[PDB]
Structure 1
Amino acid sequence: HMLRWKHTSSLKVANEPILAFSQGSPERDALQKALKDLKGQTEAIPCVVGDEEVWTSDIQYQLSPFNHAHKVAKFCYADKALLNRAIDAALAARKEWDLKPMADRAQVFLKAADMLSGPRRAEVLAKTMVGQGKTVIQAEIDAAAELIDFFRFNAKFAVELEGEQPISVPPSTNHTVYRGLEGFVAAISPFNFTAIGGNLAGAPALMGNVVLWKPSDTAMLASYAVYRILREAGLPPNIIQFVPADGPTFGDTVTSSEHLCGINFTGSVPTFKHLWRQVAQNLDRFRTFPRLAGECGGKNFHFVHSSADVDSVVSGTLRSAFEYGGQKCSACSRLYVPKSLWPQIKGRLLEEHSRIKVGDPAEDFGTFFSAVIDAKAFARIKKWLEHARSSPSLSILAGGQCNESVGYYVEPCIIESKDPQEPIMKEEIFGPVLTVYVYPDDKYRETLKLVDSTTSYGLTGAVFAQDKAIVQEATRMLRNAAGNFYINDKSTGSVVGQQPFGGARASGTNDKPGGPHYILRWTSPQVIKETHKPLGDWRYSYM
């Protein structure tokens, strides 16, 4: 017995509670304090390579979306030389980290999760509110609950994976070693969820990888807070490098390294395609075949059958379309309503719309949602509103206003299209812009087909109906129209361990972060066979 394999244990975890933030609650008090702690503050956030805080001359600012005069962070872009130094230092740390027992790596993430749950909760929530423009509850479900859940559940999944071992038959013993990927992983995270950044960099690190993490410019404050928590929780130097950078510069640099083994990406279709093509162009140089994982957005639907509960349709659609300003890959942006229910649904939507509060989420907890993330987002959304004012098939029913004088404020907008295949029914806006198509009741089946065929995407979707046969039929018809499919619920708000998230078609590679299989993309297994008796003669008896 040259090798001895220690018995793997099990990890019990459950989802983090979502807090209610009632008046006089400990969490509301703590959050109010943490928000006050950020008022008028700018954090100077360096690049971090190993334990070194590095500044370049390429200074950038993160602005508070609802008060863009407030520079919440000053940071800098890593240049090609710094990125390459970061790669070198990470690679030199990788073997030792990869050789650590899975349980020891998991412990770092479990400790981080407990820090986020307790003493650091108010901080990460406040930084997500002030830096990304989230309301209390949007920050809570993201920077606390989802991030905490990724860390705990991925830890559980990874520990359990070590229990997945092959059959051994005497006189040999077989064991699978879940090796990290050889090389480094580039993690490229989006502005819209603090938790996604934590997962994109953290999940590969958990599995024994080293990572260059390029956080989103517009989520820098909260992203660095998560980074610091991981380091304080025991993540060794050079396992995750914190390297904000210009997008093209970062992509060019990591795809030029012979040591690139993975890209973990969430963002646009064109950017993911470009990175895929850069890897293909440089395929000769890489020591192995890099693994690309991409989540690329959606044009998500709520489909209503005449049997639907109208109040649930209304509240679920308002939330899905407008929470966080519709800046979610999962947000409903196309609503299909039968003619027979349209007078009810139109009236209710327009009435509730007039009561939606858009304002400062730190100062007014009555706020439903706040400003969109930045000037570029504001400009894109304004372009779509101008299109809705131009198109003969479109009519703005409510909203349509925007004002960027103080923050990047866009009012929620509800549009009716007479054309089910209008460009606004197809293209992802990432803003609080809901388009409604009213279909004749006797054409529900033809309309279900349009739900499936109209767009290039396959991410989220919901069907509202109280008729079993209709639900069964719609489920079959929409099988590939949504990777996260909902019956009588809104299309947003996937919960780790409950609705693993992702979809195919143009929406990405569908590796389902939030489920037990995601971590498999970040391990390259080795199987070791040890034979305990001498080998026989090389000839066979039949010879």
Structure 2
Amino acid sequence: MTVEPFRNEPIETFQTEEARRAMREALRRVREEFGRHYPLYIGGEWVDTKERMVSLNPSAPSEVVGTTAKAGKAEAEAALEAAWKAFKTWKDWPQEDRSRLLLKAAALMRRRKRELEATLVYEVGKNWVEASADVAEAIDFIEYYARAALRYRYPAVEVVPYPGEDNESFYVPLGAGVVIAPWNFPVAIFTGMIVGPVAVGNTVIAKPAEDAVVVGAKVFEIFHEAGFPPGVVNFLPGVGEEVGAYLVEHPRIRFINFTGSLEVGLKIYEAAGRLAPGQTWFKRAYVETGGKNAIIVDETADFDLAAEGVVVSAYGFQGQKCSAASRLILTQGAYEPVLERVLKRAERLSVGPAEENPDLGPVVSAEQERKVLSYIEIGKNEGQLVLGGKRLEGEGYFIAPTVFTEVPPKARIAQEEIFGPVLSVIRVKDFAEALEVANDTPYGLTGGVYSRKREHLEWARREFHVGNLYFNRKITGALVGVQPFGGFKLSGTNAKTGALDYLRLFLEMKAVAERF
């Protein structure tokens, strides 16, 4: 099967009147459908429950954006039975056939781009460009994994020949597994975590994050329209731990793909290491568990370029990203000039309802608001608050861009992941000290350096211990194919999304010899 070489889906900037009109049409369509109820999707059919879950607009939380069915253990067991039944034949599809199905799903998703973007705007508080980036990344995962799976097709393995025998090694998929998806990229990461395993012949039960169940259901409408056979993909919105715990601990769950907090990721990895009664394999658990990502700037940098990249990295999607710059490490020569520029830029950021395309929407929920404001209270005790640090007026969960300065490297706000619009600025003497401070966290996801000094950049290339490092640009928005995405240390298992190596995680290898 031959398609165009992979290109990333263009992220809409909405600079043309047509693009803006198309977005306004989509927003209107989406809000007109706020009354909709979305069931579970199990074994090729939409399956409703008596209990329901409600999704709220975090920019106006008295407004409901939709409701969904709510799965429990029994629905979890039913999806597991459907997923294994499906696996029996889905594993046997030619890779070309599986990859074409993915390419169909991508095309369907591309045609519904604005609708999904508008759903992100209303359901999770993404501004328009954050929304467009999220949907473009989802399309990219589908496009990329569809192609990358072909690189593993029967029989892919390079082996040494032997006289008088055929020796053939090849990959096969693992089985049925569970995906536990985050709310912050509930199209992109939700989609990538499902379609990667699915591309190469696995089957998946997906649990969306509670805050993003409506957009996950809309992704499943796309899967259903594309024609995935019954049981290949399954959708189980649920409240709290019930569904996730039941499946993670199940003797018949083959693998777990998780993106979310370190707290939950640790529990998952530990549970995966245990043999449940009657289990007959060693579970694979892939976890991406957040970061405490720093940007270093030294005295040689373009200070204006740095301040722009820092503000984008710190406050894009309200800093609710595993890749967000939450630390700003400035050498002595860079300290005042860069801090001054960041403050002047950050003070001009708009905050408001996401549908108006502000620089910042609200944080995602009342619980998130609580967590972020709690950390602000801690930061006031630990460093010097110099911008923001408060809730803004409106029912929506609006928090001001916040900056603490003179923060000790080992302070709680310089160590713990806040996941909100809070930047901690750490002053150091020189680049050596900057690198020490950068590395001295439990995390290792993203990181950045602004500097013109080649020796410093190349030193960072070798020694700034993060899985995704960026020089003289923002540290967020890793593109599928371009920047394999995944971290070190307590940022997770280094399962690199948007890379050829990702699909290998969902395969095992068989070696078959025939002596003639």
TM-score (structure 2 length as normaliser): 0.95
What SS does structure 2 have at the residue aligned with 1:86? helix
Aligned equivalents of 2:4 and 2:281: distance in 1?
33
What SS does structure 1 have at the residue aligned with 2:281? coil
Within a 5 Å distance, the mapping from 1:238-277 to structure 2 comes to 238-277=231-270
Counterpart position of 2:472: 488
Contact 1:11 1:160 in 2 (8 A): no
Superposed CA deviations along residues 87-134 of structure 1, whole A, max 9, x for unmatched, are 1122111111010001111111111112222x2111111111111111
Counterpart position of 2:509: 525
Contact 1:413 1:434 in 2 (8 A): yes
Q: Which runs of 5+ in 2 are unaligned?
A: none
Counterpart position of 1:412: 401
Counterpart position of 1:541: none
Contact 2:11 2:133 in 1 (8 A): yes
Determine which of 281, 293, 297 is the counterpart of 1:300: 293
Contact 1:308 1:464 in 2 (8 A): yes
Matched, 1:381 2:372: yes
**How far is 1:295 from its partner?**
0.4
Tell me which amino acid in the other structure corresponds to 2:350. K
Tell me which amino acid in the other structure corresponds to 1:524. E
Matched residues, number: 512
Counterpart position of 1:539: none
**How far is 1:283 from its partner?**
4.1
Aligned equivalents of 1:360 and 1:528: distance in 2?
59
Distance 1:418 1:375, change over 3 A: closer
Between 1:54-63 and 1:85-94, the stretch displaced more is 54-63
Q: How many percent of aligned residue pairs carry the same amino acid?
A: 32
**How far is 1:424 from its partner?**
0.5
What SS does structure 2 have at the residue aligned with 1:74? strand
Superposed CA deviations along residues 175-204 of structure 1, whole A, max 9, x for unmatched, are 33321113x110000000121000111111
Contact 2:258 2:286 in 1 (8 A): yes
Aligned equivalents of 2:262 and 2:48: distance in 1?
31
Counterpart position of 1:52: 45
What SS does structure 2 have at the residue aligned with 1:151? helix
Counterpart position of 1:437: 426
Aligned equivalents of 1:28 and 1:97: distance in 2?
41
Distance 1:55 1:345, change over 3 A: same
Aligned equivalents of 1:140 and 1:256: distance in 2?
36
Counterpart position of 1:202: 195
What SS does structure 2 have at the residue aligned with 1:414? strand
Counterpart position of 1:446: 433
Superposed CA deviations along residues 3-33 of structure 1, whole A, max 9, x for unmatched, are xxxxx878732211222312322x3322210
Determine which of 90, 115, 128 is the counterpart of 2:120: 128
Distance 1:476 1:278, change over 3 A: closer
Distance 1:223 1:357, change over 3 A: same
**How far is 1:155 from its partner?**
1.0
What SS does structure 2 have at the residue aligned with 1:241? strand
**How far is 1:284 from its partner?**
4.8
Contact 2:431 2:456 in 1 (8 A): no
- Please tell me the root mean square deviation across aligned C-alpha atoms, in Å: 1.8
Matched, 1:147 2:138: yes
Matched, 1:75 2:41: no
Within a 5 Å distance, the mapping from 1:179-190 to structure 2 comes to 179-182=172-175, 184-190=176-182
Aligned equivalents of 1:158 and 1:501: distance in 2?
18
Counterpart position of 1:229: 222
Counterpart position of 1:512: 496
**How far is 1:140 from its partner?**
0.8
Tell me which amino acid in the other structure corresponds to 2:79. A
What SS does structure 2 have at the residue aligned with 1:39? helix
Tell me which amino acid in the other structure corresponds to 1:302. I
Matched, 1:399 2:388: yes
Counterpart position of 1:476: 462
**How far is 1:173 from its partner?**
3.0
Larger radius of gyration: 1
Distance 1:351 1:256, change over 3 A: closer
Tell me which amino acid in the other structure corresponds to 2:405. E
